[PDB]
Backbone:
């Protein structure tokens, strides 16, 4: 929803249409669509991190469960 992206700290480097540090959620959903692994793939870089798709900025790992992480990839996609 929204309170799940604040208490955690994902909005720190993200935002619907507020290009700041990380890739705004909106842009993240546009990068994928119809993929058969957009949930495991996204949530994958969510519970681990990495870089190379948005530049060289190496994103840090996060401490989230595969459940809330799955809701962040399914919710981020539902966002235009
Ligand atoms: C800044 C210190 C960040 C914090 C804190 C979080 N994320 Fe992040 N995220 C960041 C960057 C720089 C990137 C892009 C990697 C790069 O090339 O630099 C990302 C990317 C994501 C993605 C998409 C990755 C993909 O497969 O394209 C997701 C889904 C994502 N981030 C989720 C996420 C969540 C849930 C966070 C809170 C726990 C979070 N990020 C924090 C930078 C930063």
Residues:
């Amino acid at each position: 929803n929204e309170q799940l992206a604040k208490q955690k700290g994902c909005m720190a480097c993200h935002d619907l249409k507020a290009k700041k540090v990380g890739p705004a959620y909106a842009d993240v959903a546009k990068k994928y669509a119809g993929r058969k692994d957009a949930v495991d793939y996204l949530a994958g870089k969510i519970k681990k991190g990495g870089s190379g798709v948005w530049g060289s900025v190496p994103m840090p790992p996060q401490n989230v469960t595969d459940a809330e992480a799955k809701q962040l990839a399914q919710w981020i996609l539902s966002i235009k």
Observations:
- The two ends are 14 Å apart (CA to CA).
- The chain has one domain: 1-80.
- The chain has three helices and no strands.
- Residues 8-10, 12-14, 21-23, 28, 31, 42, 45-46, 51-55, 57, 59-60, 62, 64, 72 surround heme C (CB under 6 Å).
